[PDB]
Symmetry: D2
Subunit: 296 residues, 4 copies
């Protein structure tokens, strides 16, 4: 059958009425896939070969006991058909090292959702630089004088770190300097400034794109809604790029008609959209994995 | 003429009788290129466009004054023909962010030595996993029991961090556990174990590869020597891979006949090999840049 | 009655068959004291006055439910008769700040076990510098050459950080330099070197001293034993110093006949000695608190 | 004669037209004291004895060469008559460890300006809790809800870290939450809130107190002024406390008539007040050291 492995944060600490990874494993199990559970420290490389200690997993929607380990084994990752990298942020050097281990399994045949090269290529915040007609005014910089200047042109801006801690600097704010000194760690780290978008008050929308195809309903942060006309427009412009880069399950953050962020590591909000609308997002996902597998 | 920019650590603090970047700028200047000096904080991105504050640079082999700024300007990086990313390690998230800015200039036409995607793809220590027949026995892992076990099979090993702090664990060593707990930061970070290679006592050799072509003389750490037969063998096996990945100037670390490391960010030792042998490594480099430029 | 407060790490995560703080609260409760539970973040200072959010606590030896909160209140800490600072290490700047808040309650009348000034005065490892006839050869330093030299005089030594990660450097060890560079963080932090004491193989003993009086039975790390003649000697030399500094409950680490460490923040091993011998260490402690209270 | 040692940051990097430590050594030299220069890493403890590697120092007001080492020696610190701890902040655990080494010399007879116990006892920001009638409304806390509440009572406040990065939170500010989450590092570190004092626009004054005696002229941050009537009042209330705690050279920060901070580690502004007024602050200091020495 299909052997599906998943790399995620400790399953003993998730919340099963909210967790999207849990919802994914329930579906994989319903289709009869064999599940192999892994945490970051279970992955290792012995002379170029990617291996891991997996536990064969059984999951059930039960708040006292939602998982059971039914086997334990040390296998080559190239013995799995597909691996869901569902590790949470930050995207740090430890995450970059795990991406090289997954890439060695990938060369030997395993499908990796999402593709390790593209996880390294597509930072959630700096990747929007490749879709500049879809985003707000964005400055990435290490210095105060440029941030101050961006603030004079736009009057009301958003400063965030790259590495949610967002500061709003609007007219008359006494704090531009200390905020920029704290976020750049005194001119030694890049930070991002964008102009403030007042339509955030209508909802910061989370849109999902399953292998280039927008899921028809999104969640505005919480209210599920159909995609508006502008959500369709944005999502279909990025979608072919995400499909060809092997970004099979993607979350887009849209405030009003502007694209603000692209979650490529662990996009969530599956449970809240499936509860209101007649869509099986996890079904869409496993259908996309099954197509990718009987292809290459 | 050719407009060459360079991103490096403060030029006011290098040692000009040793610095390879300095040797590169002297050569570029001798061929009449216009030089543009940049530090990390000079790079920024305004709505997808890569820009920087550069200073037009003049360099001379003079220990009281080896550089002069002769102009200052804010330009788009796509106005440079080529940029030498010569920033020193560590390879951290700040270095990964700079690689995305350089990649936006690269899309608009600038040659980047070395290619930003490949700097992210090719970690100095984990990239040797792709040339496993050329390297020592290597385990990358987060746990103690696997390291202890690697130590039972090999008896005398080398433990290093991924992120030089190398520990040697030979028979009868009382410290395996604390070393692995310190280097893995208590099982939370990957570390590397390799078997100890006694031929390090003959020299840890630094070999240079200019766009897939080995420089005929290397430096064994310090004694310049011609490449042995085994150095030729190793360097010519990796060289086509480095050429196609846009890794135009590479340093390989070879102890005996084993490849231990691949420096892809700021390879040095130019000055020590040019002082003994009749080779102009910087000439080889600028010749390779000139070919790449009158090509694509 | 006596109102006893305790500052400790989350009571929901301790192990009640091992925790010494738990054993203390059971005793305080048996004597009918009112218990007030606090974590670090519950402590605050409003214009010089020390206050905290406490929960009135009920504890029971029950592995499903060992505590219950039976009230919640914001009070001045000067309304407590005594506070057990039982916060675990490290001893960092956050711990030093909490010590100033406890000291403001102390000035207004509360007994603080142990005294905040003395927690700042008596570092577990550097305080043994005041009992140099009782300790091994000890060097505290930032440099390699002094450590190397200490190693030439003693041949087999122990290197530890100040801030258990102990390294043993015995004859023929290849790692002196990297260990000293890692532990001093390249000459920027003090570390400690002591000569290795081979009698650690007989047990690293944990001796308890309740307001200057040694508890007659200690635990050798695990085997409970009576104090030997040399344990009596060591403990009675330090004990008057600990009583006058307000160090009411102290743990001493003794390997052979040498004093290696003085735990002044959260000394444990109560449960393991009470289980074998007919001593109530917590009874000794509450008896000492009751004396101190009907005194000053 | 008097043997004076000084522990300070690298003398090769100070600015001699501004540095107060430099001004102190020029004076000590004019009175014919022998000077012994030390950095932090020169201090060490061998079996309870405080020692250091000193260099015998010669200083001169010359911008090409303001110091010369005229001898080198390893001595016990108890061979110095007095040591100026003039190390810059932060006040961290490394600084606390150095304070224990200086205290071992102090027990053997050396005068330490300022007294090591009192450096540990008197944090620059939390020590103002002992002079609450002289300070603004001050809350030290780890939580958001208390900070928000302090902000409702006062409407315009100052938030600073304990560990200058001050934020001003006045009416209509959108950032209270992220500022408190950044400064408390998500509820894990204490921060300080004080009400904003609008008279800072008249000058944040730096007042100096030499062994309990206010220097008659202060610097308002830069304009030298005589002490006002309220500066005299504040400084003479704290001064007997500073004298008895062995805080011989102290800087007080006064905005309007409120005491905001007490610099106990490395108070400066000597050069700017001596340049305008006929006061020799360093003379006052050496006079105070000379009295302390021919006393105890």
């Amino acid at each position: 059958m299909i052997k599906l492995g998943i790399v995620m944060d400790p399953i003993a600490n998730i919340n099963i009425k909210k967790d999207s990874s849990f919802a994914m494993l329930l579906e994989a199990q319903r289709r009869g896939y064999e599940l192999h559970y892994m945490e970051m420290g279970d992955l290792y490389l012995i002379n170029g070969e990617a291996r891991a200690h997996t536990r064969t997993l059984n999951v059930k929607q039960n708040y006292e006991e939602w998982f059971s380990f039914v086997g334990e084994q040390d296998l080559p990752l190239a013995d799995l058909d597909v691996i869901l990298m569902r590790k949470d942020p930050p995207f740090d050097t430890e995450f970059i090292y795990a991406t090289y281990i997954l890439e060695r399994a990938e060369e030997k045949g395993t499908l990796i959702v999402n593709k390790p090269q593209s996880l390294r290529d597509c930072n959630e915040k700096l990747f929007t630089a490749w879709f500049s007609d879809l985003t707000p005014e964005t400055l990435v910089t290490r210095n105060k004088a440029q941030l101050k200047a961006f603030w004079e042109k736009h009057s009301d801006i958003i400063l965030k770190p790259l590495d949610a801690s967002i500061f709003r600097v609007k007219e008359g704010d006494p704090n531009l300097g200390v905020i920029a000194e704290t976020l750049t760690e005194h001119g030694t780290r890049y930070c991002m400034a964008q102009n403030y978008l007042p339509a955030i008050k209508d909802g910061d929308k989370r849109v999902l794109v399953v292998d280039g195809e927008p899921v028809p309903y999104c969640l505005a942060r919480g209210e599920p809604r159909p995609l508006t006309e502008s959500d369709w427009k944005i999502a279909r412009q990025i979608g072919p790029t995400l499909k060809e880069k092997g970004l099979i399950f993607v979350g887009l953050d849209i405030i009003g008609d502007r694209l603000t962020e692209i979650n490529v590591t662990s996009p969530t909000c599956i449970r809240e959209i499936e509860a209101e609308f007649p869509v099986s997002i996890t079904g869409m996902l496993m259908d996309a994995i099954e197509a990718r597998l009987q292809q290459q």
